[PDB]
Design a protein around this ligand. Sequence first.
Ligand code: GNP
Ligand code: CL
Ligand code: MG
Ligand code: MG
Length: 298
Amino acid sequence: NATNVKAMKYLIEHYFDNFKVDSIEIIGSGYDSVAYLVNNEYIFKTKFSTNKKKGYAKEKAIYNFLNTNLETNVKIPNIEYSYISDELSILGYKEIKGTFLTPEIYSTMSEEEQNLLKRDIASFLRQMHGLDYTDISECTIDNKQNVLEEYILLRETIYNDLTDIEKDYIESFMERLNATTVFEGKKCLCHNDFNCNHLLLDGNNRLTGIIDFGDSGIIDEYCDFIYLLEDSEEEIGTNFGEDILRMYGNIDIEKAKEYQDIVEEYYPIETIVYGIKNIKQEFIENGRKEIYKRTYKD
Ligand SMILES: Nc1nc2c(ncn2[C@@H]2O[C@H](COP(=O)(O)OP(=O)(O)NP(=O)(O)O)[C@@H](O)[C@H]2O)c(=O)[nH]1
Ligand SMILES: [Cl-]
Ligand SMILES: [Mg+2]
Ligand SMILES: [Mg+2]
C-alpha cells in the first residue's frame, strides 16, 4: 500500500509547484485509475496511459462547463489542479463532504425524507439535461454507434473462436439493437454514471453533492435513469427510479426501462470488449461466463 501513495505524493508535488502533501491515502480505485484524499481536504484522481487518451481532458471540460452554467445548491467537483498528458492525468479538487447514498440509508429515511431526496435528484437532472450544450458540443457520445464499432472489433478478433451459445447471445442482442427505437429520442448532457456511489447526502439526508462525471457527455436523456431503475443490491430499486422519472416529467417511462434493459443485456459483451481493447484475458473470460449464467437463469 505505502508505495503508490509515495509515488503519487511525489507526482503531486512535482507537477503542482507550491502544493504540499502532509497526508495522502487511497479513497478509491477504478480498474485503471486511483483516487486519493490529500490533506483531508483534496481529492486527487489519477490515471496513467489508457484507451481513452483524451479522458481527463473531457471530464475537466465538463466540470468547467457545469460550474459556469448550473444554478443549484448541489455541489460538484470544481477543478483547482490539473495535469493532462498522454501518459498521465491528474485532477484535483476540494472533497465534497457528505455520506454516500446506500440502500441501507434509504430504508431508514421517512417517507417524506425519501420524497425530498427523489425531488432533489429529479430537479438536478432536469436542470442538467436542460442546459444548452453548445459550448461542450465535442463531448457527444453515440451509444448505438459505439456498440456497432465494438461488434466490428469482435468480428475482427475473437468472434470466430466463441461458442455457439456466446455467438447467439451476441447476435440476439444485435437484433434487438436494430429493432429498438430508444436511441432516437432527446439528446442532452448526461452524467452517464448516475448511481448511489456518486450521490452524497448532507446531515439531513438531502442531496448535497454529485461526483464522477468521468463518462459524461451529450447522449440519450434515458442514460441518466438506468441505475436509478436498477433492481440490485447496490442500488435502491425500480420504484425509486420510477418515482424520480414521474417527478422529472415529460419522459416516456417505458422507453427508459427498455433503455436500461438493453444496456443491462449488453454488459457481458461490454466486458468482453474491454478485455480485447486492454489486452486483459480475465475480462474476456468473465464476460463469456456471464453469458452462460444469463442464458441458464431461465
Ligand atoms: N466524499 C467524497 N468522496 C469522493 C469525492 N471524489 C471522489 N470521492 C471518492 O472517490 C471515489 C473515486 O472517485 P471517482 O470520481 O468516482 O473516480 P473513479 O470511478 O474510481 N474513476 P474513473 O472516473 O477514472 O473511472 C468515489 O467513489 C468516492 O468514494 C468527493 O468529492 N467527496
Ligand atoms: Cl476466454
Ligand atoms: Mg466513480
Ligand atoms: Mg469515473
